[PDB]
Symmetry: D2
Subunit: 342 residues, 4 copies
């Protein structure tokens, strides 16, 4: 029942790519904002949601200088963006590549409804994914991202929701690897709700436990993957206050009860945390007493570009300032990714 | 954990549609041949594989007269075809509809490789399926077909292959029903191989057992579905000869050990059987001593149009003869679907 | 992967035994009351809970005359009782056997706690069960009973509780059959709670769906088993009133969405129903419009001996009256088992 | 769905006990030989299989001096033995306890047949296990052992065999922990066969993956357990020769793809290896380049007492020599448990 999914050479390539991304003090810039979600972010600072205005903004990020090299191991592109160029006619991909940063693409095609559940979902994107990966690889991508979304309520992460999702992730992962692309498995358990830290840890543990069993079933090569989970934290509506110490404690405990040592790194998602909240929590995590067999860095989206976006404000002059705001957060998180951030 | 997937009204509509299709002495004409597989069939009789030549041939089938009404409960269309018209400018859908026959569409988007298996597969098509169903319904379809393919060898229907597939079917089924479309769950276990009847029955039983547990997990409404399995039979390469009695015995036993009584009908697939072989076996099945809580008819593809296609031979004159060859088989199978075929 | 669990001869013996038990108008007398639960029942009518007082009472039941032959297909014994004799020194087993009624024994060794759940359980008894079955068979038993217990609450029939239990049943069943003993699979979903009919049906459907998938996994011979489920009904504390018609409707729907046609019969458990309530509901079930591929009779405990026990009251004179009260209910339920009870 | 299986205090006690056992340079002496298997071992050196001859031999082991303290973290007792005393009337348990070594008992009640499989099994012992654990704890035991057995052949570790077993282990584990007893989960994949290293690794990975998912499902506290797997190695009948380096490489890879970091230690089973083979392989493992989040020591049976038993030969004089042979192997393996054995 063992028919080698990957050759020795292939496993190597995947493992290498994976390790480069989560290399010490390095994290991931998640700039894979769909043209849709991008509309919301741009609206907050004025800016019409044009393809141009998006190219312009992405440029603000990608034009960061060399100090971004020490803290950014990879950049997740949104399809559109993967084919855009800066004002000099230089492919954004080219630029990031030249700085030695790894290139990636969001490949999932959005979340969809699970009939019979309490507003739960699953994710689509598997159709033609293999051809697409082959193409993306051919265009410079070495890793991908697929986002599943789970929710916590009186009865939400349901057997079905956990069953599916865990399975979809495994499918997606399997397909990426046979195309020389490291897959970031992202089983995001939303913070919405008034649940306490205990509960989030519980649910996180059960979800991950399922996710890895699925990966096993689908013969996914663990050492050639990355996990992008949510940090275990109270619901946005939970009244209780917690120490980033307490959060780090629960998060690391959860992870070390479910993630096999073979996984090279866990790239946390900023979620609804503030630029600082993310940095503090990440730092705390990397300072947790408990032993960690894997890299514990970041794969932040807003937590890396909030202030940056706020500075730019659509103005061509504010470009450099915006870029600074980004490089700043990129650097601090690069430190938090080693617990050495004060 | 019970959040009503379907309203009472909806369950009704599905159940009705299902029952109309498998009504006594009625079966399904499977004319959902992909433009690809259609090339092979047309090549055998000359005929260039044009959209026109296909429209022409499908016309030969759909132009059958009213005696087709007693034996054909439904017709499965291939996308393209669902929008073609006869020489009078009349939508093929319209015609079939006017005869009171139910309209259906193949919605799966083909089989794909399961990395790490011995040439096993799964099926894709889930992306956007809900929107598509909504559309197809709006265009006259009331039921759909999705084909998964399993294979028998020293170690083929693997836990993974059975796990996935069973799951995909459940997903597909779930989506169809929330769009008022009865789904035909088709877990086809290919005949290729030299395995004996015993083995095929075994594998068939295990596969189905998984398929229904999956449907349960996904909250699929059984009484609003149909099962299109393979009849349990020896591998094409099995030396041993079996009575259609023996085949019927194994097939019915397998089905009654796995299919819940709630499933309205099982529409067998002709597979690699000859026009007669299918009719004989189906008849035998409907004459099996064992009790059957469900309709046991047909959902034949080649077994209904082999001779028809052979007669037409692409000639406009042979049209009527071709149509006769079809109506003939359609009628006999309509009889075999009641065990009353001599 | 198919290594014949049972020979053709063996499958036959099991199937026969099964069918004899659920033969038309016939049901099961469940007199397998543990010495513990027997204490409670005896206390309600005075009577010290002695081995003798128990033998005496069981005698009241087993001394029923020949009219018990038309409505009682089998009698479930409690270990102790299986070796007791009437006042004439005649083995209770002998007596029941001579009337052509089938003999059975409760073999489970009680329910136990599932650590980490909300007061949920599982059942023990598997240790040495094979040797025990071999013995019981050698002593006249041809079928056995094992009771698992599930509970309905905001979050009770938990994945774990359903997973285990379903699995234990399968183990127990598998072991019985390899010892020529038909196993009664009893996944009882308690009525406690204020849940409505809808919910009980839902939970019942999910539990059964799991139970049969388990049986499949363990290679249990379905046509050589019997299902002793709870009728789907509202919780004891549900305010809503339901027609025995409504109850029959839900119960049969649930069963026909999960039980394969191969199962010879479903022997409902009286649960907390009154002698009449059980009879009415059973009758209604057997009069439900929906088709049923299996026998739908009873495997009643209190519902057959409530009034009987109440009459006896421990008095040697009241013996005959008590026996009458039993024969009465046994007969009516034998009618309800055919929907012909007014 | 989270109802705390263990209190904070309890989790602590378990974790501590676990860590003491696998403390650096320390391993486990497995002297839990059933009176049955003990007959075979004694026969090889003459010695009648008496309770006395067994007590005598166990004494040879337990009378080891203080240098056994640095390499032996725990001793697994066979029930009988747990209540035997040395010639001075001193409880073997007392002695081991005074040296600060942890006491454990085999609790499984033997392997049994899985009907329908190719000579596969499962393990029994769950009946009354909770009461028994409570007792054993009360008698000085702090950890237990349960052995499941899997086999490798063209089609042996079957879905069923893996499903069950993994489940039984989880049950056993769950019960032990609620009784303050650390459970050693032993899913032994036998070496019998002519399969190569690759295959054993594959099967080992799949089995473990299932085992841990099961533990999760049953809410077993990982950091309060221990894993006693087989080292991944070729079948006894495999022609190919492998470096203990190669064996260590496969073994560690397998383990780090399945065992969560939370598991304190993996105590390998000597299996059919020779006293040296076990020591060499263990050493190699502890010298493998790959990172290991857990202790990698031994839980040897014959590999610790082969020569010891061979020396004793039943002679009262050879006692001391026998004891030396044991202490010798105990020490070397204590070194191999740190990769520092030459």
């Amino acid at each position: 029942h063992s028919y080698p999914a990957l050759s020795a050479e292939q496993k190597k390539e995947l493992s290498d790519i994976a390790l480069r991304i989560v290399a010490p003090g390095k994290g991931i810039l998640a700039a894979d904002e769909s043209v849709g979600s991008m509309a919301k972010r741009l609206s907050q600072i004025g800016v019409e949601n044009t393809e141009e205005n998006r190219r312009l903004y992405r440029q603000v990020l990608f034009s960061a200088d060399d100090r971004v090299k020490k803290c950014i191991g990879g950049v997740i592109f949104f399809h559109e963006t993967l084919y855009q160029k800066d004002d000099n006619g230089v492919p954004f991909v080219r630029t990031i590549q030249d700085k030695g940063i790894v290139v990636g693409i969001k490949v999932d095609k959005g979340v969809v409804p699970l009939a019979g559940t309490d507003g739960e979902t699953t994710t689509q994107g598997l159709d033609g994914l293999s051809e697409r990966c082959a193409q993306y690889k051919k265009d410079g991508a070495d890793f991908a991202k697929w986002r599943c979304v789970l929710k916590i309520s009186e009865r939400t992460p349901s057997a079905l929701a956990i069953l599916e999702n865990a399975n979809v992730l495994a499918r997606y992962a399997s397909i990426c690897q046979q195309n020389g692309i490291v897959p970031i498995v992202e089983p995001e358990i939303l913070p919405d709700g008034d649940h306490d830290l205990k509960r989030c840890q519980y649910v996180t543990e059960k979800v991950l436990a399922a996710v890895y069993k699925a990966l096993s079933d689908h013969h996914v090569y663990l050492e050639g993957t990355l996990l992008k989970p949510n940090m275990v934290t109270p619901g946005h509506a939970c009244p209780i206050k917690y120490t980033p110490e307490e959060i780090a404690m629960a998060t690391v405990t959860a992870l070390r009860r479910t993630v096999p040592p073979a996984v090279p790194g866990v790239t946390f998602l900023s979620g609804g945390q503030s630029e600082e909240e993310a940095s503090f929590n990440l730092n705390a995590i990397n300072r947790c007493p408990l032993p960690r067999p894997w890299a514990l860095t970041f794969s932040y989206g807003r937590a890396l570009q909030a202030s940056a976006l706020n500075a730019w404000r659509g103005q061509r002059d504010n470009a450099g300032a915006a870029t600074e705001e980004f490089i700043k957060r990129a650097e601090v998180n690069g430190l938090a990714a080693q617990g050495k951030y004060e």
